[PDB]
Amino acid sequence: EQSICQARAAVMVYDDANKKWVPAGGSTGFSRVHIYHHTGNNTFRVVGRKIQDHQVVINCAIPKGLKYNQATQTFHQWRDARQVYGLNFGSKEDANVFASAMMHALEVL
Amino acid sequence: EQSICQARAAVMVYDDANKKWVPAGGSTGFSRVHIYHHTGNNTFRVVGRKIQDHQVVINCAIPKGLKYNQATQTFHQWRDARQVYGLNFGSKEDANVFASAMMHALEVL
Numbered sequence: 252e253q254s255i256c257q258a259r260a261a262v263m264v265y266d267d268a269n270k271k272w273v274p275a276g277g278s279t280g281f282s283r284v285h286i287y288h289h290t291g292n293n294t295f296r297v298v299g300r301k302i303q304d305h306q307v308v309i310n311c312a313i314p315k316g317l318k319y320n321q322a323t324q325t326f327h328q329w330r331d332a333r334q335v336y337g338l339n340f341g342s343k344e345d346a347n348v349f350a351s352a353m354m355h356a357l358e359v360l
Numbered sequence: 361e362q363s364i365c366q367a368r369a370a371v372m373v374y375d376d377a378n379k380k381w382v383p384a385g386g387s388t389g390f391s392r393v394h395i396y397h398h399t400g401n402n403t404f405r406v407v408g409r410k411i412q413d414h415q416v417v418i419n420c421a422i423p424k425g426l427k428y429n430q431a432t433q434t435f436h437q438w439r440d441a442r443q444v445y446g447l448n449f450g451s452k453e454d455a456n457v458f459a460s461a462m463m464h465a466l467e468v469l
């Protein structure tokens with residue numbers, strides 16, 4: 252597993268019942284969010300760990316054809332069949348780094 | 361893995377930074393919460409799955425010596441080194457079933 256980017260973001264999931272974003276993994280705060288590339292089968296995953304306690308708060312696949320929505324310059328989101336994920340980036344530079352790597356993955360899948 | 365109880369509860373985790381309970385796994389709603397016994401090493405785990413979509417929202421160890429707090433007749437809680445867990449039970453009967461199995465586990469560990 253090779254890291255292809257690192258970006259600072261608060262990782263959020265959407266609680267559709269209450270129509271609001273909640274912190275991924277249950278605790279508010281910033282994470283270091285990677286995209287990891289597994290070269291053996293050319294797969295990519297988003298993996299984020301809390302800066303403070305290292306808890307993995309997101310570990311999700313990036314499937315071919317994913318629609319990655321850059322809602323704002325610092326909040327991007329996507330979904331799977333079960334959850335909606337959001338990254339509230341610490342800076343525009345972090346958002347650009349992460350989006351670049353994401354868009355690359357989606358181009359080579 | 362043998363189930364020793366099933367109880368209906370909304371599984372919550374405490375957000376230490378934002379001082380609020382958040383739904384475990386990111387989505388509000390009730391789960392079926394088991395305690396499972398692994399006889400090979402006499403271990404016990406709390407495992408809860410959303411009723412609707414089957415998401416595993418809790419899968420945590422029950423260590424010897426755990427302090428299980430029956431805060432109210434329908435809200436019980438405990439913690440590990442990283443998180444605080446809460447079960448908002450659907451009824452007093454559900455709370456009693458779960459608490460009795462938890463207390464059993466803690467007696468035989």
Ligand SMILES: CCOC(=O)[C@@H]1C[C@@H](CC)[C@@H]2C=C[C@H]3CCN(C(=O)[C@@H]4CC[C@H]5C=C[C@]6(CCCN6C(=O)[C@H](Cc6ccccc6Cl)NC(C)=O)C(=O)N54)[C@@H]3C(=O)N12
Pocket residue numbers: 263265272318319320322323326328329330335336339
């Ligand atoms: C003050 C600070 O607090 C906020 O403002 C809150 C918490 C802030 C972080 C702490 C966060 C930050 C920024 C803003 C940015 C705007 N935004 C929203 O949520 C917008 C508002 C409208 C709302 C409606 C829907 C919602 C959520 C549910 C998913 N979705 C969709 O639109 C999906 C999108 C999609 C499109 C294509 C592909 C994939 C996907 Cl996923 N569409 C569909 C068809 O699936 C969404 O994203 N929505 C954020 C926000 O409010 N907040």
Ligand SMILES: CCOC(=O)[C@@H]1C[C@@H](CC)[C@@H]2C=C[C@H]3CCN(C(=O)[C@@H]4CC[C@H]5C=C[C@]6(CCCN6C(=O)[C@H](Cc6ccccc6Cl)NC(C)=O)C(=O)N54)[C@@H]3C(=O)N12
Pocket residue numbers: 372374381427428429431432435437438439444445446448
């Ligand atoms: C009516 C309105 O109810 C609410 O609005 C919310 C949502 C309600 C439904 C989901 C839920 C239900 C019932 C009440 C019951 C009260 N309660 C709280 O959270 C109390 C209030 C004060 C607050 C402060 C701390 C907090 C959380 C963090 C853990 N902890 C501790 O005290 C721990 C406990 C502990 C003791 C021993 C062993 C293990 C552990 Cl874990 N102590 C320590 C030393 O670890 C806690 O439990 N707290 C609930 C609540 O408010 N709500």
